Amino acid sequence: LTTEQINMTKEQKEAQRAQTSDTRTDGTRVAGSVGKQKELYDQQITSYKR
Amino acid sequence: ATKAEYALTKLKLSNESVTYCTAQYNLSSMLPQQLLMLKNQTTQVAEQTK
Secondary structure (H helix, E strand, C coil): CHHHHHHHHHHHHHHHHHCCCCECCCCCECCCHHHHHHHHHHHHHHHHHC | CHHHHHHHHHHHHHHHHHHHHHHHHHHHHHHHHHHHHHHHHHHHHHHHHC
16 A cells, blocks of 8 residues: 555645646646646637637 | 362463463464564665565
8 A cells, every 4th residue: 555655645746846847847748637727728718819 | 288289389380381382382473473574664764664
């Protein structure tokens, strides 16, 4: 069970790293739910300007 | 009184005999099993360190 908690800790770290950073620990761009959420803000920002 | 004391010494052999068998069982069974218990605990400490 301790070994399994290692993976969860790593994944929860990525969720924290989603803030204040656009890249994960390995360097790839975030694309999950938080990545989709940011794209919605970009469209909304353009919508308000338009 | 000496005869009564002789019976007490004679009967005391039973306690010594069962003690030897009890100690023999502990060495043959309990001690090796405890060693396996300690080894698993040692591995858990490293995982918690990780």
